[PDB]
Structures are given as C-alpha cells and as structure tokens.
C-alpha cells in the first residue's frame, strides 16, 4: 500500500483456507500525482471513469485537448437541449 502510493485499499472478502490466502475482491485508489515516482511499477495504468453513461463525441474531443496541454479545458454535458450554456474561465468561477 505504501510503496505503490495507494490512498485506499480494500479486500472484501479476503479468504484464508487450509491451502492459503485468496484475494477474492479488490477496490483501490492510487494517488495519480505519484506517477513520476511509480511509473516503473504502475506501467500503463488506466483510471476508469465512474459507472454511468459514456462520453458524447464533443466531451471526448475536449478531454483530448486537455490531456495534450498545460491548460485546463473541461466540459460535461448536463442537458444537450438546455437553453443556458456557460463558457466560464476558472475552476472556482465555473462552480459559482
């Protein structure tokens, strides 16, 4: 847990029989920012998005722009047929 920079690790159930230890289930989070240290051990680690609907093609486009730059470009569609659209500068202000 420490050596691979986890922030959360759960094994439910952990099974111990006469034969040995079995890890039946595993739920974990890693501190993604530790990549510069752990890249070697983690490899090409993938962080899945939470279960739910998949990204519209426009969401995927913006995600690609964000990943390829030092700038923050975020977009999530709530109601495609809504009449109120926002293009706000800053993580704080966008919430407000």
């Amino acid at each position: 847990y420490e050596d691979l920079y986890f922030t959360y690790l759960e094994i439910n159930p952990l099974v111990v029989t006469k034969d040995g230890v079995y890890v039946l289930d595993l739920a974990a989070k890693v501190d993604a920012t530790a990549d510069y240290i752990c890249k070697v051990k983690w490899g090409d680690i993938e962080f899945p998005p939470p279960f739910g609907r998949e990204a519209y093609p426009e969401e995927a486009y913006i995600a690609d722009l964000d990943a390829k730059s030092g700038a923050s470009l975020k977009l999530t569609l709530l109601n495609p047929k809504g009449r109120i659209w926002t293009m706000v500068a800053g993580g704080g202000a966008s919430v407000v």
Binding site: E2, Y5, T7, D31, T33, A34, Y36, I37
Partner: protein
C-alpha cells in the same frame, strides 16, 4: 540579478546553494518555494533545517499526498507555518 525599485535599478543576489543564502541573509524568515512538483518536497524539507525560516509558501500543484503529510509533520514539530501547496499565496496590503 538586475531589478527595479520604482525606476531605479537595484541588484538581488542569486545563490547556487541555499546554505550560502541563509548564511549571508540571517534577516530572512520567509521562503517562497517555486520548485516544480518533483523537487518541492526535498527543497521544503531542506529549508526546515534553517531555523530562521518561519513561514514557507509552496506554490507547486501536484505534490503526492503522502509527501505533503510528511512536510506537514515536520513543519508542525518545528513550528513552521506552511502556506500551500498548490497556492498563489496571500497578500498583506502595505506589508
């Protein structure tokens, strides 16, 4: 390094080693740390070996949580005020 004090040019010393900066400037009690997320941890830990420094501002966004916890621990035990990480800092008008 050349800088401006209004319209008058002044010189600010630049040091390779922090040890030399501290030695030549005992009047300093604040350190503003622009080290990248990779070297922010080590440079902050190093600063805390100089008792004159009482406040450290850590600008870097992206320091692993486990490391920040270690910085917090050392700062707490040494009485050093940490502003940050991932901050612009603060402002005291007139000061």
């Amino acid at each position: 390094q050349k800088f401006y004090w209004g319209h008058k040019e002044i010189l600010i010393p630049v040091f390779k080693n922090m040890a030399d900066a501290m030695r030549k400037h005992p009047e300093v009690d604040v350190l503003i740390n622009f080290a990248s997320l990779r070297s922010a941890y080590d440079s902050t830990m190093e600063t805390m070996n100089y008792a004159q420094i009482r406040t450290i501002a850590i600008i870097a966004e992206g320091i692993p949580e486990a490391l920040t916890r270690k910085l917090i621990k050392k700062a707490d035990q040494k009485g050093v005020t940490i502003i940050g990480p991932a901050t612009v800092g603060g402002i005291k008008p007139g000061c």
